[PDB]
Ligand binder design. Sequence first.
Ligand code: HEM
Ligand code: HEM
Ligand SMILES: [Cl-]
Lengths: 362, 361
Amino acid sequence: EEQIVPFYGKHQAGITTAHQTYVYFAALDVTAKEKSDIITLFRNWTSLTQMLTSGKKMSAEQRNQYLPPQDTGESADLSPSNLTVTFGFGPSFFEKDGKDRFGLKSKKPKHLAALPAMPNDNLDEKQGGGDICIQVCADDEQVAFHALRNLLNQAVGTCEVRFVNKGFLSGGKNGETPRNLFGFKDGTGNQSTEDDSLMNSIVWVQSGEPDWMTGGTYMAFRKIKMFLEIWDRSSLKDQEDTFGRRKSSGAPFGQKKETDPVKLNQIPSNSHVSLAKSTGKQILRRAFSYTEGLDPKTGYMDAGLLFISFQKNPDNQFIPMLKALSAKDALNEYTQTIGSALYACPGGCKKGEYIAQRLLES
Amino acid sequence: EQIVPFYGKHQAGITTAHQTYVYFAALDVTAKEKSDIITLFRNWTSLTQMLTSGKKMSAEQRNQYLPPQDTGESADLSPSNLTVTFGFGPSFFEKDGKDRFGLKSKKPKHLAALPAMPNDNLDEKQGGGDICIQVCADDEQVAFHALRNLLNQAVGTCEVRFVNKGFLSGGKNGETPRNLFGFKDGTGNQSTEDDSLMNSIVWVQSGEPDWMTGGTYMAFRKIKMFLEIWDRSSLKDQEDTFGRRKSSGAPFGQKKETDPVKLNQIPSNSHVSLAKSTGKQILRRAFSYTEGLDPKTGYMDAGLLFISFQKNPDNQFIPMLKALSAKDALNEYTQTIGSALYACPGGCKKGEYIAQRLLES
Ligand code: HEM
Ligand code: HEM
Ligand SMILES: [Cl-]
């Protein structure tokens, strides 16, 4: 065994866990009618995820060769590649069209609502929302896709799949901050995910939420198109100015080191770093780049960021950033948000329990 | 050092060990003069050399008012066995009966659109193209970085026709990589380290324009794979479709993946049976793709970027295509939605540029 990340724990993996290279990110709508159908679904997803992340090798026997294989096979020879699978629920899981579909509204999390419309949104409704999100990460795309596929396979009959995105973010060979598609290092401003205390104040829900959220968090999702062709033709100055860091070093303007503190009065008031840091709030950003062939509409490379961030309180920590950035981020010149969602992520699973058990009345 | 020589007798990325990631693009030349194309090929040479060598694109950082020459996302990354391969389609040589660039006298012997086959549902905008670029690396970000910087240099000269990307992970202990059907992919290929076998299967050695010497032809097919129909099929149906066992990858009746196929032991209509029975060899070097939900099926949109190399597509590849399109069991679970044939020049010598002998220095 080698690249394994415990599935069971105080929290779900794939949040504070070291950033893997690949993500597959899916949203589902529950079409089933009874909570018991959903319990079944969550039960099976638990077994299978445990199996997948542990590197438990599925086969060996597979009796009755007239039956479908229970596993799709393409990961048979592959390392678990730090596979994590994270689950969350959107507003619509709890209340859809003013109806409480599953008797769950009394256990609705404190901060779970659609994100407010923002300026420069060009949201595709079908590229956001959804009853359930599944975030699958691994250091190997094939491993990640294998997981999503086997998980989605189990949801046939109960859910319809709403969207499946995938992305990548390679870190440096020597552990440097991974660079996004704008050539800039991404994640410098995050607090240390290995600092349990900082993660408890930023990410982890500890109280003031339904019990099933304890050791959970909220996940904000934004699919943000990045106009590479316009960016690439911009001067280095314009690029650096857009962010308030230098491209190479990743250092804040005026500072020498990437990890030096940002000096606010040294970067434009309209820079991405400036706007986000002001407001004074912290989130845990854990984004991945995407490319999706040619945009049929522009004829250019369809590319962007799968912005994913975790926060114990999206209203206090994330939305104010979103408000500030959408107003006058210099970055707005080179990006546009085309998908949006907010998910509530349950606390971790204890061995012998299933995901979100405490939410569907065990 | 995860570097693969760019310069050599052949272009890299053909017999070179299969990397995990590919970006596969086609371009149309919109420029009018050969000299524009020479410039394009000259620049692509410098940049490819630079990129594949792991030369870290630096030296200075001045004139902050200019766009940076390099996009930067690969700054911290190993070259990850980056290879970049170039080829040309029929349309490079002749468009509308006219010879666009004075190149028809050096047209390769076998370069034509593949014939339409039964079951084809070709999207014309998912195939053809004047120039293909195949970018492979063990790291998607490195591969995308290369394509992007290469395409960036083509602005003004070409328009991009399509960009595909795919993956195919080999086992932790070097097993044959499995495609999205869970089956090992490439067992039947001869050894790419057997120079003689590669000379008879892949490499052009004579009877072609001189710029093709140590070149090859690249057949491309974008083949959708219906994962949801496959997944619901019995193991028997799956194994029967191919004529090998899923796990071992061994031919029916044999114990080992590399044991010889015994034809009278696998269905008449199995993929392996029909392909082998043509008596012909190709070099398959495919990658899986996923592209989100198909808006039409509502399922995963997934398949194979089938890429194969052969010295003579008319003798080696087309007869396979004929046989398989007729009655391959696999036709139940796949459908070809893009097609192209490209002629790949011989390798570049240091101080020369790609396809120079065709464009005449
Ligand atoms: C929901 C939208 C986004 C939010 C809420 C957001 C938020 C943030 C935050 C909080 C920081 C750290 C600032 C600090 O406290 O020091 C940051 C930095 C940064 N963001 Fe974003 N961001 C968003 C979208 C994007 C996009 C589309 C890009 C494009 C690549 C991007 C690139 C960067 C870069 C390069 C930095 C450098 C600072 C760092 O990561 O340490 N962000 N962003
Ligand atoms: C129509 C395009 C294709 C052609 C021309 C083609 C050709 C071939 C050839 C020549 C072989 C070697 C057989 C032998 O001599 O032992 C082979 C084997 C195989 N093909 Fe294909 N193939 C095609 C499409 C596909 C697709 C879409 C898949 C998967 C979806 C696939 C999966 C396989 C597998 C699993 C094997 C056996 C393992 C191996 O020896 O490579 N093929 N194919
Ligand atoms: Cl699917």
